[PDB]
Amino acid sequence: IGIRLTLPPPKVVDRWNEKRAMFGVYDNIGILGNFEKHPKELIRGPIWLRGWKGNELQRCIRKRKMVGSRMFADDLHNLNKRIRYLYKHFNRHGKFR
Amino acid sequence: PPLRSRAYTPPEDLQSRLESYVKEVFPSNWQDISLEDSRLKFNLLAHLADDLGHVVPNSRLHQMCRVRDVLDFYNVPIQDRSKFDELSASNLPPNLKITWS
Amino acid sequence: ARALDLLRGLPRVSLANLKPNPGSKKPERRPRGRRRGRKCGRGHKGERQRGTRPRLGFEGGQTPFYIRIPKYGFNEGHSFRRQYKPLSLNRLQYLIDLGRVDPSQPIDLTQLVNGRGVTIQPLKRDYGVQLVEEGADTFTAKVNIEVQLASELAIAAIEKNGGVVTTAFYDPRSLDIVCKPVPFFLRGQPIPKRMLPPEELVPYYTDAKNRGYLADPAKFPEARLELARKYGYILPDITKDELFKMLCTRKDPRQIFFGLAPGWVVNMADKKILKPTDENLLKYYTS
Amino acid sequence: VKKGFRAAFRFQKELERQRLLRCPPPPVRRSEKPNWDYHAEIQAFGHRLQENFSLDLL
Amino acid sequence: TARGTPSRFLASVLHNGLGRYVQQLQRLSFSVSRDGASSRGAREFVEREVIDFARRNPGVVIYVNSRPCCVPRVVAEYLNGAVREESIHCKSVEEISTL
Amino acid sequence: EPVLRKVELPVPTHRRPVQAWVESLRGFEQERVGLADLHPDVFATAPRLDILHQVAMWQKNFKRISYAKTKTRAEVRGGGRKPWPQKGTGRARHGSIRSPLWRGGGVAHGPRGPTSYYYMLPMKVRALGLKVALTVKLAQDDLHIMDSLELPTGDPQYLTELAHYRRWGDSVLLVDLTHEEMPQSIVEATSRLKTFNLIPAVGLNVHSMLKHQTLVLTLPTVAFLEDKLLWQDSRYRPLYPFSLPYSDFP
Ligand SMILES: [Mg+2]
Ligand SMILES: [Mg+2]
Ligand SMILES: [Mg+2]
Ligand SMILES: [Mg+2]
Ligand SMILES: [Mg+2]
């Protein structure tokens, strides 16, 4: 048996808190603001991902370049190993040549 | 504060009442007067809605080119009965029972 | 309209109603089930399936196709063979008519680009524009065009209508400045001075047959009359034109913009132009 | 705890179904369960048999 | 499967067609939510199909109520005591009429 | 005293403008204060709901970083040695106690690192979406116009009652011109309420419009919107970012 018996507590979502009521506001700051700013300049998050996209290999390479010299030793060694593996995989393994 | 009802009953003498208001603002063949001017369109529609308790919706103010169209719009009624009371008003057969509240 | 009337009697539009346009969001494929995944499409056992088949272009040991065919310099030097974006007379007429370029003002590269008539890429070894003979017929415009090359037919097409065409040169560093000036005026560097052609090109820009900007401005009439005599029209006397003062105007070598002298600094914030006064700086720039 | 609600509610409904086979409720008048109005029922009883019963006598 | 399933013999309620045919269904309860998205076909059926069905079958008492609040359903009761429920949630008006 | 308003930018010669009432918040029954004209290509575009979908989905996803990481088979602690030799015993071959197979191992294919989902639609598509949203919220008797968002007193009860009086809806999105010029009364009132949201015109977006039922623009706002959205059709292809100076672009 892998199914619960009593009902879960009700997850109450407040669809009108501040974060949801104001979602998206200023996502047209460029078109409606004389192009002073750009939408990407509102993306809050990692230093090395604000307004950029890519597969895991490119993401790891970018992380190494921009914060590789600030990383803890073991995390950085893991990152280098990961880049090595992904290089081998994306460049030698796969259905399509 | 006392909310107004959407129900509208187009008066029988409407075609006369309307003309009085036209005389207040604007000749024969008045049905074809153009309303490209906006000052007079506003005056007319404001008077009509202050009288009949019915403002045209914003979605139907560019469909009113000529006063003929104002008359046409005011010749269609609006029902303030939700499905609640339109279901239980069609002389239901005796063997169908609806419950609402 | 019609559809806008339909929307009135439908429910309110909200994030509960949206939809993708049919045919756009193709469905996904995952290896689950008796069809998608039992071998998930990878085939029988073999290095195909494991994802270990040789590199793209390995023909199984037989000498590959791209190695048994000898080398030849189809591309040797390609990074240094200069390139020029054509500007057909058809396109020049089209731009003139719709008011994009202004024939009552000297047409340099800057005014071809500011009207989005051609797209110059300095960084890909484009040096400038070349007029091409296409559309010599039907070209009727009085333009003072400064380009970087010209077939003799284009020279004709521009002369026959009382126009002056002159072939200038722009080095890769100044071409970027002339093509997209406002960026340069933002960098803050003082306006550099145009370099002279390379060794291989001076015989081109010092020949009257090509309306070169360094050939002597006294052999030009002979060239113009020769061209007219070959192409069967009468060289109009431009000296009497209502606006010949404009068709005369030219940029001297070592100048990028028309009314700006190398060494000035453009201040766009305050609407000013700053000029030096130290004798050494003037000496360097004026040369 | 697996996160979710649909399987929990589905299992509760199935348990209720099983609990209404063992220990079925004591049967009660159809005139007490929901969805009942006597007038419509008696008139339908009439019309069902193809007979024009007088309503008061019936 | 047959072995794994009950069985019965061919039969009728009260020798139905012998004297006079009688319609076995006698009550039909519709629960239709006034708001739920799954109650859309049901709302269409009630709005433009239930009156005609009531007229065509005057031996069936049709009740309709609006208090499941999320899921519709139709419960058919018969002369011989049998009840039979059917889901009409997320179905079209054609499907509901056929059912 | 009417408060008219004509369309400034040129209208194509084959299309008449659309129109709307100009209401006031200064009183409960102050609708039809004036009549305003609205440019057809910004308030009467083709419906085009699918573009509304494109824009709302981009507006949801372009700013998402998924912070989900799962330790691969080489990032989990330990796991170096071969647990038992290959041939001798009778157990399954294994070359680590941290394969995905084993309990406590690593995910073979799991969420790797913080993932960005950013992408940008052509600017024209997003402006077109804005126009589509405005026209849909007009065609369905939901868009309004106000001379100003002024109010008699900042008490929120007044604003919510007024919204009740006119069938506005559950939620209202009020739009004013500049963040500094919204009047004191409206900002004070709309701080407490929950489904009433006050934004300056520079923040108008598709998702925040499709969320709220009613959209209430000031008149200066509609002027601003017509200017900034008509600028997209009939502009050259860029020569460099519009943040850099141009001859005609403020
Ligand atoms: Mg996949
Ligand atoms: Mg060999
Ligand atoms: Mg290890
Ligand atoms: Mg191993
Ligand atoms: Mg683990």
**Do the Cβ atoms of B43 and F2 come within 8 Å?**
yes
d(Cα F81, Cα B39) in Å, to the nearest integer? 90
Strand E25-31 and strand C272-274: pairing? Answer: unpaired
CA-based nearest residue in chain A for residue D14? A5
CA-based nearest residue in chain F for residue C187? F244
The answer to whether F111 touches F65, Cβ cutoff 8 Å, is no
Question: How does C28-37 read in b/e, with b if 16+ C-beta sit within 10 Å?
Answer: eeeeeeeeee
**Do the Cβ atoms of B95 and D43 come within 8 Å?**
yes
Ligand 1 center to B38 CA (angstroms)? 59
The answer to whether F81 touches C51, Cβ cutoff 8 Å, is no
Question: CB count, 10 Å around CB of A17?
Answer: 10
**Do the Cβ atoms of B46 and F17 come within 8 Å?**
no
Give the gap in angstroms from C-alpha E10 to the nearest C-alpha of chain D: 24
A-contacting residues in C 23-52 (Cβ below 8 Å): 41-42, 48, 51-52
Start-to-end Cα distance in chain F: 34
DSSP H or E stretch at residue E54: helix E50-56
- Supply angle C-alpha F239, A42, A69, rounded to 5: 95
**Do the Cβ atoms of D48 and E61 come within 8 Å?**
no
d(Cα C13, Cα C41) in Å, to the nearest integer? 42
d(Cα F160, Cα F172) in Å, to the nearest integer? 10
Sheet with E25-31: list strands edge to edge. B96-98, E61-65, E25-31, E73-78, E83-86
CA-based nearest residue in chain B for residue D41? B95
Rounded to the nearest 5°, which phi and psi values hold at C103?
A: -70, -10
**Do the Cβ atoms of C42 and A95 come within 8 Å?**
yes
The answer to whether B15 touches B71, Cβ cutoff 8 Å, is yes
d(Cα C242, Cα C234) in Å, to the nearest integer? 19
- Collapsing DSSP to helix, strand or coil, B51 comes out as helix
Rounded to the nearest 5°, which phi and psi values hold at C108?
A: -100, -175
Ligand 2 center to C71 CA (angstroms)? 22
**Do the Cβ atoms of D44 and E61 come within 8 Å?**
yes
Please name the amino acid found at residue C187. R
**Do the Cβ atoms of B83 and E58 come within 8 Å?**
no
Site from E28, E61, E83 to mutate, D interface, most D CB atoms within 10 angstroms: E61
F142: chain C residues, CB-CB within 8 Å:
12
Q: What DSSP character marks residue F181?
A: -
- Which residue among D34, D35, D47 places its CB closest to the CB of E59? D47
* Dihedral sign, Cα of residue C261, residue C198, residue C84, residue C105: positive
C15 touches chain F (CB under 8 A): yes
Q: For chain B, which residues lie within 8 Å of any Cβ of chain F, measuring from their own Cβ?
A: 1, 3, 38-39, 41-43, 45-46, 49, 55, 57-59, 61-62
d(Cα C102, Cα C246) in Å, to the nearest integer? 12
Chains C and D touch (3+ CB pairs under 8 A): no
Give the gap in angstroms from C-alpha A44 to the nearest C-alpha of chain C: 24
The answer to whether A63 touches A75, Cβ cutoff 8 Å, is no
Closest CA to F147 of F180, F176, F187: F176
- Collapsing DSSP to helix, strand or coil, F88 comes out as coil
Give the gap in angstroms from C-alpha E7 to the nearest C-alpha of chain D: 20
CA-based nearest residue in chain B for residue F139? B59
The answer to whether A52 touches F237, Cβ cutoff 8 Å, is no
Strand C126-132 and strand C144-147: pairing? Answer: unpaired
d(Cα E14, Cα E16) in Å, to the nearest integer? 5
B87: chain E residues, CB-CB within 8 Å:
46-47
- Which residue among F126, F229, F243 places its CB closest to the CB of A36? F243
The answer to whether C191 touches C264, Cβ cutoff 8 Å, is yes
Can you say how many angstroms the Cα of residue B3 is from the centroid of all Cα atoms in its chain?
18
Strand E83-86 and strand E73-78: pairing? Answer: antiparallel
A58 touches chain F (CB under 8 A): no
Closest CA to F199 of A83, B72, D1, A25: A25
- Collapsing DSSP to helix, strand or coil, C245 comes out as helix
Q: How was this structure determined?
A: cryo-EM
Ligand lying nearest the CA atom of residue F79: 3
* Burial of A72 per CB tally in 10 Å (0-12, 13-18, 19+): exposed
Q: What is the 3-class SS of D10-36, one letter each residue?
A: HHHHHHHHHHCCCCCCCCCCCCCCCCC
Q: Which residue has the tokens 């063997």?
A: B95
d(Cα E84, Cα E78) in Å, to the nearest integer? 9
- Token pair in block for residue F84: 């038992």
Beta-carbon contacts of E64 under 8 Å, excluding residues fewer than 6 positions away, are B96, B97, B98, B99, E29, E30, E31, E32, E46, E50
Q: What DSSP character marks residue F5?
A: B
**Do the Cβ atoms of C15 and F141 come within 8 Å?**
no
Q: State the residue range of the domain holding E89.
A: 1-99
Q: What is the largest CA-CA distance in chain F?
A: 101
**Do the Cβ atoms of E58 and B98 come within 8 Å?**
no
Please name the amino acid found at residue D37. D
- Token pair in block for residue C245: 């003062």
- Which residue among C1, C3, C19 places its CB closest to the CB of F50? C19
**Do the Cβ atoms of F207 and A23 come within 8 Å?**
yes
CA-based radius of gyration for chain E: 16
DSSP H or E stretch at residue F34: strand F34-38
Task: Give resolution in angstroms.
Answer: 2.9
d(Cα C148, Cα F16) in Å, to the nearest integer? 49
What residue ranges do the domains of chain F occupy? 1-250
d(Cα B56, Cα B48) in Å, to the nearest integer? 9
Site from B58, B80, B82 to mutate, F interface, most F CB atoms within 10 angstroms: B58
* Dihedral sign, Cα of residue B30, residue B31, residue B32, residue B38: positive
DSSP track, C98-131 = TTSS-TTS-B-HHHHHTTTS----GGGTEEEEEE
Start-to-end Cα distance in chain A: 46
d(Cα E61, Cα E75) in Å, to the nearest integer? 12
Ligand 2 center to F35 CA (angstroms)? 88
Rounded to the nearest 5°, which phi and psi values hold at A29?
A: -60, -25
d(Cα F105, Cα F82) in Å, to the nearest integer? 14
Rounded to the nearest 5°, which phi and psi values hold at F237?
A: -70, 145
Ligand 1 center to C30 CA (angstroms)? 6
- Token pair in block for residue F218: 């000031």
Closest CA to F64 of A58, A55, A44, A41: A44
The answer to whether C129 touches C148, Cβ cutoff 8 Å, is yes
**Do the Cβ atoms of D44 and E65 come within 8 Å?**
no
Closest CA to B58 of F133, F44, E8: F44
Q: Which residue has the tokens 């995952």?
A: C30
Q: Which chains share 3+ C-beta pairs under 8 angstroms with C?
A: A, F
CA-based nearest residue in chain F for residue C14? F210
CA-based nearest residue in chain C for residue F49? C18
The answer to whether E42 touches E65, Cβ cutoff 8 Å, is no
Closest CA to B95 of E58, D35, E75, D36: E58
The answer to whether C107 touches C145, Cβ cutoff 8 Å, is yes
Long-range contacts of residues A14-22, Cβ cutoff 8 Å, at least 24 apart:
A16/F171, A16/F194, A16/F195, A21/F194, A21/F195, A21/F197, A21/F211, A22/F197, A22/F199, A22/F208
**Strand runs labelled E in F2-137:** 18-22, 34-38, 65-67, 114-116
- Token pair in block for residue A80: 């280098």
In this structure, chain F runs to a length of: 250
CA-based nearest residue in chain A for residue C40? A95
d(Cα C111, Cα C181) in Å, to the nearest integer? 11
- Token pair in block for residue E58: 């005057």
Give the gap in angstroms from C-alpha B95 to the nearest C-alpha of chain D: 6
Ligand lying nearest the CA atom of residue C62: 2
Phi-psi region of F144 (alpha: psi -120 to 50; beta: other; left: phi over 0): beta
Strand C265-267 and strand C272-274: pairing? Answer: antiparallel
Please name the amino acid found at residue E93. V
* Dihedral sign, Cα of residue A71, residue A74, residue A79, residue A80: positive
- Collapsing DSSP to helix, strand or coil, C133 comes out as coil
Ligand lying nearest the CA atom of residue C27: 1
d(Cα F137, Cα F61) in Å, to the nearest integer? 24
d(Cα B9, Cα D1) in Å, to the nearest integer? 61
Q: Which residue has the tokens 């949630």?
A: E89
The answer to whether A36 touches F243, Cβ cutoff 8 Å, is yes
- Collapsing DSSP to helix, strand or coil, F174 comes out as strand
The answer to whether C89 touches C157, Cβ cutoff 8 Å, is yes
Rounded to the nearest 5°, which phi and psi values hold at C86?
A: -65, 145
What residue ranges do the domains of chain C occupy? 80-287
d(Cα C123, Cα C108) in Å, to the nearest integer? 20
Q: Which chains share 3+ C-beta pairs under 8 angstroms with A?
A: C, D, F
DSSP H or E stretch at residue E85: strand E83-86
- Supply angle C-alpha E67, E41, B76, rounded to 5: 95
Give the gap in angstroms from C-alpha E8 to the nearest C-alpha of chain B: 33
Total count of domains within chain E: 1
Site from A4, A7, A11, A13 to mutate, D interface, most D CB atoms within 10 angstroms: A4
Packing angle between helix F123-139 and helix F219-230, nearest 10 degrees?
140
C-alpha distances in Å from residue F198, one per residue of B34, F23, F174, F242: 39, 17, 5, 28
F49 touches chain C (CB under 8 A): yes
Phi-psi region of F223 (alpha: psi -120 to 50; beta: other; left: phi over 0): alpha
Which residues make beta-bridge pairs with C126?
Answer: C83
**Do the Cβ atoms of D1 and A7 come within 8 Å?**
no
Q: What DSSP character marks residue F103?
A: T
DSSP track, C168-237 = ----HHHHHHHHSHHHHHHH-PPP--PPPP-GGGHHHHT-GGGTBSSS-TTSHHHHHHHHHHHTTS----
D16 touches chain A (CB under 8 A): no
* Burial of E37 per CB tally in 10 Å (0-12, 13-18, 19+): exposed
- Supply angle C-alpha F7, F10, F13, rounded to 5: 110
Beta-carbon contacts of C26 under 8 Å, excluding residues fewer than 6 positions away, are none
Q: Which residue has the tokens 């034109």?
A: C241
Give the gap in angstroms from C-alpha D43 to the nearest C-alpha of chain B: 8
d(Cα C146, Cα C255) in Å, to the nearest integer? 13
C-alpha distances in Å from residue D13, one per residue of A7, D10, E83: 11, 5, 18
The answer to whether F161 touches C29, Cβ cutoff 8 Å, is no
Q: What DSSP character marks residue C26?
A: P
The answer to whether C133 touches C154, Cβ cutoff 8 Å, is yes
d(Cα E66, Cα E70) in Å, to the nearest integer? 10
Q: What DSSP character marks residue F201?
A: G
Question: How does F220-237 read in b/e, with b if 16+ C-beta sit within 10 Å?
Answer: bbbbbbbebbbebeeeee
Ligand 2 center to C73 CA (angstroms)? 29
DSSP H or E stretch at residue F210: helix F206-211
F141: chain B residues, CB-CB within 8 Å:
57-59
